[PDB]
Design a protein around this nucleic acid. Structure first.
Lengths: 60, 175, 83, 44, 85
RNA sequence: UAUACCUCUGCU
RNA sequence: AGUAGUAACAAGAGGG
């Protein structure tokens, strides 16, 4: 509906390879912070924990 | 290509690729860029006026109102106490009992955030006291045969250990 | 009263001094007890004479861990937060 | 939702249930229940 | 004052006040006024209800011993002091 | 060391 | 032997 009659449309069937291996807890920290921007700092800190704990995660 | 650093509290060879060099091949790479993320996250805020506001607001009321009970629900969790996976209800009950046996009992209030507080404080106590169970064998007489029976053994863990156990994430093969 | 109006709850108002005021001045409690209370409350006033928020913060161990986690070219969790 | 000894909660109700089951509902049974309630409560 | 209340009031009222007050977040060390207020409010609730019984005929009576025992019933029920639930 | 038995377990 | 398939089963633990 948003396009014009003289335009093309392609769809890509998509899979992201190595999804989890390449997603970083530090970025999750950046996200959670930026999302919470302007909120109470106790709430800002409380959510920021998990990204940090993940950034320093060790695996059995 | 990332930056290696030894952790102060752990000594773990921690790799950091964020804000690292940009890749130059189609191979898989984890060198994201903080400013580029924030740009997208900002744009997402831009495109949805006051979404983050209500989103956070709902989470605030949630946090404030959330009892500890809510954590007995859900999938199994790795129980640092037993070094095995356990149902949430037990894995929690064990952690609370240990917290209680040591110097932690804010959760006694009955609200998730108070329990959630204790966890950050527990990183301070360097000598964490936990009870172990082990198999001893007694001797019984019949109107004489050996007998098996379980005994308990208190052990204390170092900062190094407890901090690791807390940051420990179990692994399995998916079937 | 101007708050408990509607519901017919029995209101009894005492004081440290000695005076008293119940609902409609129909005192259901016997006189000796009501006197004894006014004595105790007096003795309390004599003895007394002759005598919100919500918070959460990183402790040191975790604070250092927070400082450790964040991206390169940053030193402090507070600094990165500010950024 | 409650922050209180599990036993205390049971006792407190055990009283009023036993009382109102008589008051507006035998006193020897009531006394027997209250005696038991106290008798237990004595034990630490 | 914390010591003033702890000196002038009994363990039951102290413990009950210590319980009931622990809900908002405040404590007797910082917010003494409401601790003493609730303590006195409790003490009056006790003094008002104690020793008062009802007879089998339906008459109101007061007594010394205060142990009920079959033939008598408590006249007043003490709501305040118990747990909210 | 070997041979017989006996008990517990069948996702832990 | 056979099952099986990136590691296992082909009994395990105990009366040691």
């Amino acid at each position: 509906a948003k396009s014009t009659d003289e335009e093309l449309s392609y769809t890509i069937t998509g899979d992201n390879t190595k999804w989890n291996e390449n997603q970083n807890p530090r970025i999750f920290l950046a996200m959670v912070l930026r999302i919470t921007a302007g909120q109470p700092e106790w709430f800002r800190d409380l959510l920021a924990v998990a990204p940090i704990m993940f950034s320093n995660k060790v695996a059995r | 290509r990332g930056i290696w650093k030894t952790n102060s509290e752990t000594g773990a060879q921690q790799l950091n690729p964020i804000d690292g060099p940009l890749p130059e091949d189609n191979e898989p790479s984890g060198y994201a860029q903080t400013d580029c993320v924030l740009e997208l996250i900002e744009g997402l805020d831009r495109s949805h006026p006051g979404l983050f506001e209500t989103a956070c607001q709902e989470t605030i009321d949630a946090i404030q109102q959330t009892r500890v009970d809510k954590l007995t629900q859900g999938r199994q969790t790795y129980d640092w106490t037993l070094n095995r996976n356990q149902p949430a209800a037990t894995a929690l009950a064990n952690t609370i009992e240990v917290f209680r046996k040591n110097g932690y009992k804010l959760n006694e209030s009955g609200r998730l955030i108070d329990f959630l507080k204790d966890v950050l404080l527990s990183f301070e106590n360097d000598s964490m006291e936990v009870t172990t169970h082990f198999q001893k064998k007694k001797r019984i007489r019949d109107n004489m045969i050996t007998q098996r029976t379980i005994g308990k053994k208190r052990v204390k863990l170092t900062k190094k250990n407890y901090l690791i156990r807390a940051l420990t994430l179990n692994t399995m093969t998916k079937d | 009263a101007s708050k408990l109006k509607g519901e017919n709850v029995y209101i009894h108002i005492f004081s440290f001094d000695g005076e008293e005021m119940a609902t409609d001045d129909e005192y259901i409690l016997d006189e000796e007890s009501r006197a004894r209370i006014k004595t105790r409350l007096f003795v309390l006033r004599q003895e007394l004479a002759t005598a919100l928020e919500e918070e959460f913060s990183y402790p040191p161990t975790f604070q250092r861990l927070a400082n450790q986690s964040l991206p390169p070219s940053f030193k402090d969790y507070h600094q990165f937060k500010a950024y | 939702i409650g922050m209180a000894s599990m036993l205390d909660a049971m006792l407190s109700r055990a009283r009023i249930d036993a009382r109102i089951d008589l008051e507006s509902g035998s006193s020897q049974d009531f006394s027997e229940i209250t005696n038991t309630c106290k008798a237990i409560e004595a034990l630490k | 004052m914390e010591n003033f209340v702890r000196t002038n009031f009994n363990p039951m009222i102290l413990e009950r006040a210590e319980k009931t007050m622990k809900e908002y977040g405040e404590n007797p060390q910082n917010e003494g006024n409401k601790f003493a207020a609730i303590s006195t409010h409790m003490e009056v609730c006790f003094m008002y209800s104690d020793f008062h019984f009802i007879d089998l005929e339906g008459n109101t009576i007061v007594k010394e011993n205060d142990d009920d025992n079959a033939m008598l019933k408590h006249r007043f029920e003490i709501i305040e002091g118990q747990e909210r639930n």
